[model samples]
Target: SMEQVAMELRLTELTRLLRSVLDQLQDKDPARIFAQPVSLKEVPDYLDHIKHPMDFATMRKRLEAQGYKNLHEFEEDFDLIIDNCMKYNARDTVFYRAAVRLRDQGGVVLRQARREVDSIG
Candidate 1:
């Protein structure tokens, strides 16, 4: 019915906003380190340190699959990616520094998403 269609349209706008934010974060990622999931072969201890590992590729996959129930769920994964990087890399390392910037920038972009959702919802 039209009611169902209207609900879908509402979610579609949120999905579009989240995808745009994901692309923006990917571009901000230096060294392309956060572009995909960390290879266990390359960093054997990565899983040991990070209980919840996340990356741009995984987020995209989840988004495509409609795995997220809401915008907050999507933001959780975004924060996880940055948090995992900071936890694995030391404070002085390039990877850690990059996450710091990404976190702040992520906040700004997510704020935009909230506003977009507000207008649509």
Candidate 2:
């Protein structure tokens, strides 16, 4: 309950910290990040080691243009990935923020991935 929400709030902070440090890490070095072995299972860690991600054919058929079905499905180990991503991601932060400017509006469900480059760099 309250404890879980508190933990998730921490994860959100972590993402923002990540943005600052990785501005030139992930976007700069490729071979260096994955030039290692014998890793464990983790979120932020896994994000570092993986040299390449899902291929085209897979994502082309998988991603869609709809809000994530059960938003709560992300709550795990007091951390929420996709939910937090939307909360802190560059575009979503502003897009959803102004989306709340209306005096009468309450909330929103945004599905914001354009299939432009289904396979990200």
Candidate 3:
């Protein structure tokens, strides 16, 4: 449960990073950051390719091995993706979408992780 909580907290941190990037992007126009109008649909996929400060998959695997299953699951490797996106495309629509996606998934994971933590001592 503690491991699950830790994982969720890490996810939350990743989410915050993404959200900050989104805020930065929202304040600036894409033309300032990119050569052309950026497509929102491609944001998630592009962000997904970016690397993160930490290895989310390794963290998930470590937690899963410790019997923390639900929160350990992810629709996508969003933590690293969010981090990478923020690093490369901080002022783009793609950054916003990546952050939003991370927040959505992070919320679910956090709820499950919190539930697991509460179930423990």
Best by lDDT: 1
Q: How far is candidate 2 from the true structure (C-alpha RMSD, Å)?
A: 18.2
User: Candidate 3, residues 10-45: lDDT per residue as tens digits?
Assistant: 656544433443334333333223212234476655
Estimated TM-score per prediction? 0.89, 0.24, 0.34
lDDT by residue (tens digit), candidate 2, 39-110: 345345644543333221222222232112222321121122223333433555642333223111211111
Off by over 4 Å in 2: 27-121
Sort by TM-score, best first.
1, 3, 2
TM-score of 2: 0.24
Of the two candidates 2 and 3, the one with more favorable lDDT, higher being better, is 3
Query: Which 10-residue span in candidate 2 carries the lowest summed lDDT?
Result: 103-112
Ranking by lDDT: 1, 3, 2
Q: Which sections of candidate 3 miss by over 4 Å?
A: 1-52, 64-84, 93-96
Task: Please tell me which model should have the higher TM-score, number 1 or number 3.
Answer: 1
Full-model lDDT, candidate 3? 0.45
Instruction: Give per-residue CA lDDT, model 1, range 58-102, as digits (tens).
Output: 999988776776788988998898888888899999899999988
- Give the Cα lDDT of each candidate: 0.84, 0.29, 0.45
RMSD, each candidate, Å? 1.5, 18.2, 12.5
